[PDB]
Amino acid sequence: KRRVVVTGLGMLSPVGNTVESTWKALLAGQSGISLIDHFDTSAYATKFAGLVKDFNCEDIISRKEQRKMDAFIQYGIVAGVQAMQDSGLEITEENATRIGAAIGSGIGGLGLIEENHTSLMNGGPRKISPFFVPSTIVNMVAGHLTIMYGLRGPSISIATACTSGVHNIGHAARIIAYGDADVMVAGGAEKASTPLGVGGFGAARALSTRNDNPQAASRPWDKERDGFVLGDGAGMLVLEEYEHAKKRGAKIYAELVGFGMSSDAYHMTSPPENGAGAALAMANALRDAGIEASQIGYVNAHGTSTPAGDKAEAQAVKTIFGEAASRVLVSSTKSMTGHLLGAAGAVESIYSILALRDQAVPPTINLDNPDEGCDLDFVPHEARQVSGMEYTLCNSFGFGGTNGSLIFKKI
């Protein structure tokens, strides 16, 4: 059985523009949520989001090429470049066909869809940019990265809304394990903090409207929660077959030992109740890794700060972990970054990997008063030092959609 390890990390998040700076901010409980100021939010019920601060890609992407890329493509490229550099991999003509990418997004390029459609409405089809389509579709992060590094291996882009990150990483590992590749760059990127994004999720009544206190808005499992908070960024991992990684002396952060999927088969307008879909994804991940739930030390929850979804996820954890549910650590880093949608599962896989390296678990901030029946250890307020932790579980749950779970193992 071909084993799959993680050899490179790259990240942009609302709390940092690198992996280590993001990780340090999260362990310190720092919120990345702030008031939007790049468009007029006067008519919007939600006026804040988790934004990438002081983003500077000029050394990686020329201004000419930036104009052909929606913001989410720029984030994904920069995070991917970070990951490739962190991996220290040398791409040659000999190995180029064995290296690919699995990089997705939930919404893609809303910003440039707006811009080109505005151009169309004001001036007709001759004002649409020739780069409109390649500047906006979700597979273009992989497209640009494969060209920049000369990658010729299998390349896919999974767009499964809020579980895109885990699905892309999980299927990058499947491709490697199957033998179609030896290395894969996998993750996701998102930039939905646009007039159509904020208005669209706000039209669905899904966003928190706590404009007076944006850093307290994202509060998973807290009684005062009122919807999720949008976040922008990107996470990328370099996955590698284990023997390939050891032969070249790669740094090895963790092993990816389990990947499970499921569907809810119910609309989200219907009650989530027990989280049976989330439990099935976790159960499949455990079976795939060949471990019991009691061996998981930390769960990076979905935890979006939505009333019904947070409670159903707590029931799913209770179902899987049983007697060990009181002991396992669970936390939602979305309390600090907001919901990165298709990139959420990607940056959260990174958090689950670094938790194994540093034996420390990031907190769920803003958890001032847990709901009745939200009696698990959610690591409120402050990060938790741990010891002997060998497995972590990273979850992305659709609660009215698809589900994905990844299990990482130390060394």
Partner: protein
Amino acid sequence: STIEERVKKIIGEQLGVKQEEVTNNASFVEDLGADSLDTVELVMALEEEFDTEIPDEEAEKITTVQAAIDYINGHQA
């Protein structure tokens, strides 16, 4: 503020080249590194800057800096 200067400025920022490189005899494809979609985007930028409409058959003949200058020259007064 000078149409020649204005055209070179647009070409320079569109194709990502310094003003020193935007010579009158430079061709967009062979000299300034443009691809065929870059050329489309460049003509559109010229249309937007000078509030003019360049037909498809004429746009295809705008292949050098001088051609772009000459076109915007003889389509004002």
